[PDB]
């Protein structure tokens, strides 16, 4: 009919789409078949769920998961927006350029190198951080062993590395606003703080909303590769997160079914929380 | 542009200072280890550095330079980055080109297929298991074809294609050019900006890629840097060989670590200007 007619016209174009479709089927959707692993082996199943329901090590990981998700949203997410505003207000040209190169750069530093930077900085009697404390008489602290310090060390290292590169997007958004909106406001005698509150931010809101529902999409997996590297036995309590718990059991511990199932519980909620995100985003913000 | 009010001028200055302060905090660790790597083991071990190198001696670098695994693993990433990108490009660039033209029947459903993978994933273990029975474990090509297509890199590529006026394709068709030869002759050199942001994101993804590499790989000779970097840099437990080397050398563990990560980030610090040089050419 219609179909067959185009399929000859676009055949070469229709060709290109296939390997990409083949790939996604094989490496993404085909593993989705393995989701039936909710039955160890020979099916069932749904029990280890209630076993995964009850663990004193697990129930704290999820308790730690959404906890870490809170602080990441609190401190981590708004910071690149802040950085974007702070850069936009910079005159002097190249000076602003200099700031951008410096601040953006840590993004390209590997996460495992970042971790290494942390362990070498926070090492007792060796690490420069402890040394600087001994200078002013703050004594010394072993940071990686203390569960108290784990999260502050993380989110601070995360905003060092990623908050600059994330600021590019917001910075690029506020650069897309026609100056007429700003110039006419200056004519009415607006102030820099008045502007960023009454025009800049409101104009950028559609951007920060979209980025938020993406941020919420991964909100349960936050800090996976960082934690898995640096988390000590003593900090196991606060540091362990569902994604980590899954890894330890899934790959290290070689327990698949209970993990894959715990994988589902993480995946569904993530798919849930992004739906509750997207709704309230599109609805209220445009 | 025009300066003026005090409520600005003061605000403007304290902004540049605060941002400057933040900027120094961000540049600090980079200049630190650069100095610390050059410094001497005894110096770093107690009170010194904090900014500048101290007793030099340059001895930590000699260790890593004769490390074969280091240079072995470095080679693996260069392999993985170069070929991994190309495999991604070949799977994405034409794939999005097809996805761009809305004469396709599947345009509705094929888009859903790809995009659905964004907000829902099979999970950690099922991906690994599918890697297992596909026989791709401990295999370099398994790493390459394992991660090539990203949903984001596709819809971004299709959008730039869609962004281009169809008049180019139309003009080509009027002259007789059909599809793929349109893609390579006109749409691709038109797509250079989209091509940039893609080949870049895939690049760094390969270079700094760690997890799935160390999980899917067994043979040490296939290990891609950051995996090998994990062992030495964070875990920080070493052979007696290196322990024996500590006393006969006068560099330190920390100084070696410093030198290692320096040699690790230089090519990264390298592509960054390339990256920067890249985006502001006026790109749509």
């Amino acid at each position: 009919e219609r179909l067959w007619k185009d399929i000859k016209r676009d055949w070469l174009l229709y060709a290109m789409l296939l390997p990409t479709i083949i790939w996604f089927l094989i490496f993404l959707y085909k593993p989705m078949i393995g989701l039936q692993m909710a039955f160890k082996q020979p099916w069932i199943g749904f029990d280890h769920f209630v076993t995964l329901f009850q663990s004193e090590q697990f129930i704290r990981a999820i308790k730690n998961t959404l906890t870490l998700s809170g602080l990441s949203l609190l401190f981590g997410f708004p910071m690149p927006i802040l950085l974007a505003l702070m850069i936009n207000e910079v005159y002097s040209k190249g000076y602003r350029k200099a700031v951008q190169t410096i601040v953006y750069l840590p993004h390209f530093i590997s996460i495992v190198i970042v971790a290494g930077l942390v362990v070498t900085f926070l090492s007792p009697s060796t690490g420069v951080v402890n040394n600087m404390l001994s200078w002013i008489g703050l004594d010394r602290v072993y940071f990686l062993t203390q569960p108290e310090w784990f999260r502050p060390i993380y989110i601070s290292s995360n905003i060092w590395k990623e908050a600059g590169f994330d600021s590019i997007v917001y910075l690029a958004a506020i650069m897309s606003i026609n100056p007429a909106l700003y110039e006419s406001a200056q004519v009415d005698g607006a102030t820099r703080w008045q502007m960023i509150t009454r025009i800049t931010l409101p104009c950028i809101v559609p951007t920060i909303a979209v980025l938020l529902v993406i941020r919420l999409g991964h909100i349960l997996e936050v800090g996976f590769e960082y934690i898995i590297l640096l988390y000590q036995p003593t900090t196991y309590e606060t540091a362990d997160v569902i994604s980590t718990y899954i890894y330890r059991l899934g790959l290290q511990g070689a327990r698949y079914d209970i993990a894959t199932a715990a994988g589902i519980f993480n995946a569904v909620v993530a798919l849930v929380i992004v739906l509750f995100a997207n709704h309230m985003s599109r609805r209220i913000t445009k | 542009t025009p300066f003026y009010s005090r409520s600005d001028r003061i605000f403007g200055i304290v902004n540049a200072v605060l941002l400057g302060i933040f900027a120094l905090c961000a540049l600090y660790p980079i200049i630190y280890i650069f100095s610390m790597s050059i410094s001497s083991g005894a110096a770093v071990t107690q009170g010194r550095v904090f900014l500048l190198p101290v007793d030099i001696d340059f001895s930590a670098y000699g260790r890593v330079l004769h490390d074969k695994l280091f240079w072995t693993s470095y080679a693996n990433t260069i392999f993985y980055t170069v070929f991994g990108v190309v495999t991604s490009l070949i799977f994405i660039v034409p794939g999005a080109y097809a996805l761009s033209k809305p004469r396709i029947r599947g345009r509705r459903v094929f888009g859903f297929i790809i995009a659905f993978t964004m907000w829902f994933n099979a999970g950690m273990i099922p991906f690994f298991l599918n890697m297992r029975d596909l026989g791709l474990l401990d295999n370099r090509f398994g790493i390459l074809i394992g991660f090539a297509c990203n949903a984001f890199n596709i819809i971004l590529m299709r959008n730039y294609f869609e962004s281009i006026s169809a008049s180019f394709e139309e003009a080509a068709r009027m002259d007789g050019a059909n599809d793929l030869q349109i893609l390579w002759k006109v749409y691709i050199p038109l797509a250079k900006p989209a091509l940039a942001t893609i080949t870049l994101l895939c690049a760094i993804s390969r270079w700094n890629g760690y997890f799935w590499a160390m999980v899917l790989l067994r043979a040490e000779e296939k290990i891609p840097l950051q995996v090998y970097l994990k062992k030495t840099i964070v875990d920080l437990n070493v052979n007696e060989e290196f322990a024996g080397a500590l006393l006969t050398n006068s560099y330190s563990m920390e100084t070696v670590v410093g030198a290692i990560i320096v040699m690790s980030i230089i090519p990264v610090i390298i592509v960054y200007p390339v990256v920067q040089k890249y985006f502001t050419k006026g790109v749509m």
Partner: protein
């Protein structure tokens, strides 16, 4: 080469959305015909259907004896000049023109004779080896034309070619196009949203509103005798004065409008006007004068001046009668001190009347 294209009941359908309603047009060989109208009309859609860039949802169209409905754009013996810069910015100008022909034939095709002509035509001797990156929009559109004319088609296709060009450029390219058709003479169909380009270039003008086809005829036919109030309001340098009026006392003699004003009417045979009939009274600004040099008596209207805009040796007068205002174009540079009353003199032969319901040309 010189060919005739016939379009019969051609209709394009998107989803359920019957975009063009079966417009039918027959085009003489060597004829310059212009499609013109407002936006969101099938002017382009029709042209594109001719080119083969869009499918025919019904009806047939053919060039000479060849039915091109199921044909391919390559084999349709047509060439198209698009609205936005159809030239590839990487290739050089010489390579851009010759592009279609280097796909196949080389060495016996020569290509040099053909490019020589086209180069000679738009005068691009110094520009042969140049690149679109360092060319003017007009030059870009010129070489784009070179692409078409090097193909040597039966029909030329133009989709709003000068639309993206500046005004100063439009008047130059417009002369060059008319001049070009005198030189070459190939059949050409032309699409514009601009009334001006239609009146100038076209042998015949066909106006299309919202998918339908409003009228066909020589430039002066549409100007002198518009089919409806739309055709009347569209063409002409200013808009024609469309205000409502009535008949009352007698029919073929007097027509009165809201300004407590009354106009005697020329008899005109074939008129059949009804006494009392709701009507709109059209008149062109050039067909309206001031107090009257000559005249006079029963040929005029009384008004009070709103504003006067001096342009050239001419001037645009805005005068207010009733609840509505009419615009008259007066010759000169005198004094029209706004706010005082004024008498305008209407030309009796050029008046036009349209029914209020049946929006078409009664008088």
């Amino acid at each position: 080469m010189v060919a005739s294209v016939s379009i019969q009941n051609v209709v394009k359908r998107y989803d359920k959305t019957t975009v063009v309603h079966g417009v039918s047009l027959d085009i003489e060989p060597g004829e310059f015909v212009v499609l013109v109208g407002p936006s969101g009309c099938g002017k382009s859609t029709t042209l594109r259907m001719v080119a083969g860039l869009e499918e025919i949802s019904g009806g047939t169209i053919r060039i000479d004896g060849r039915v091109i409905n199921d044909l391919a754009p390559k084999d349709r013996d047509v060439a198209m000049v698009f609205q936005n810069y159809a030239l590839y910015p990487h290739l050089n100008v010489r390579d851009n023109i010759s592009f279609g022909l280097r796909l196949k034939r080389t060495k016996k095709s020569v290509i040099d004779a053909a490019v020589k002509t086209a180069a000679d035509i738009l005068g691009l001797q110094p520009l042969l080896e140049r690149k679109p990156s360092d060319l003017s929009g007009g030059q870009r559109q010129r070489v784009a034309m070179g692409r078409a004319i090097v193909r040597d088609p039966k029909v030329f296709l133009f989709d709003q070619p000068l639309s993206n060009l500046d005004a100063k450029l439009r008047t130059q390219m417009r002369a060059e196009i008319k001049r070009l058709h005198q030189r070459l003479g190939t059949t050409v169909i032309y699409v514009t949203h601009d009334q001006v380009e239609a009146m100038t270039l076209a042998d015949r003008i066909v106006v299309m509103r919202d998918g339908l086809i409003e009228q066909i005829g020589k430039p002066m036919d549409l100007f002198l005798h518009p089919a409806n109030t739309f055709v009347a309001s569209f063409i002409g340098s200013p808009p024609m004065n469309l205000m409502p009026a009535r008949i009352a006392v007698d029919s073929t003699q007097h027509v009165e409008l809201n300004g407590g004003n009354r106009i005697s009417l020329l008899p005109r045979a074939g008129t059949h006007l009804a006494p009392g009939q709701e009507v709109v009274f059209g008149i062109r600004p050039e067909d309206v004068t001031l107090d009257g040099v000559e005249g006079s008596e029963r040929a005029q209207i009384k008004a009070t001046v709103d504003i006067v805009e001096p342009l050239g040796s001419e001037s645009i007068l805005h005068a207010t009668v009733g609840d509505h205002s009419l615009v008259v174009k007066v010759g000169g540079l005198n004094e029209v001190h706004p706010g005082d009353p004024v008498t305008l003199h209407v030309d009796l032969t050029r008046v036009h009347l349209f029914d209020a319901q049946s929006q078409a040309s009664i008088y």
